[PDB]
């Protein structure tokens, strides 16, 4: 109860940004995002995607949550890449 009183919530909140090539960016996001939404509930982490910067074939992602929630998310991002026809074409 009262998720805001001493305990430092295990630790302060941290934010980190990731850059993925546009080609792998589409494999990770999926068509309906069904992939970024699921990872959001499985990791418990929050993620915000920024629009691509005109003049760059890359997409940037921002992860926000506890270090562990972020690591669990960063690892699910690196493994989603294999969705690139890697796991079962």
Domain range summary for the chain, segments of one domain joined by +? 1-89
Technique used to solve these coordinates: NMR
Cα separations in angstroms, 44 against 23, 76, 86: 26, 12, 26
Class of 1-89 in CATH: alpha beta
* Alpha helix stretches (DSSP H) within 2-89: 22-29, 34-43, 67-81
**CA triple 7-9-11, angle to 5 deg:** 100
For residue 73, count CB atoms less than 10 angstroms from its CB and return exposed for 0-12, middle for 13-18, buried for 19 or more: buried
């Amino acid at each position: 109860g009262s998720p805001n009183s001493y305990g430092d919530l295990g630790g302060p909140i941290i934010t980190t940004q990731v850059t993925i090539p546009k080609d792998l960016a589409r494999s990770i996001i999926g068509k309906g995002g069904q992939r970024i939404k699921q990872i959001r509930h499985e990791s418990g982490a929050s993620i915000k995607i920024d629009e691509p910067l005109e003049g760059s074939e890359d997409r940037i992602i921002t992860i926000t949550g506890t270090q562990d929630q972020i690591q669990n998310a960063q690892y699910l991002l690196q493994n989603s890449v294999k969705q690139y026809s890697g796991k079962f074409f």
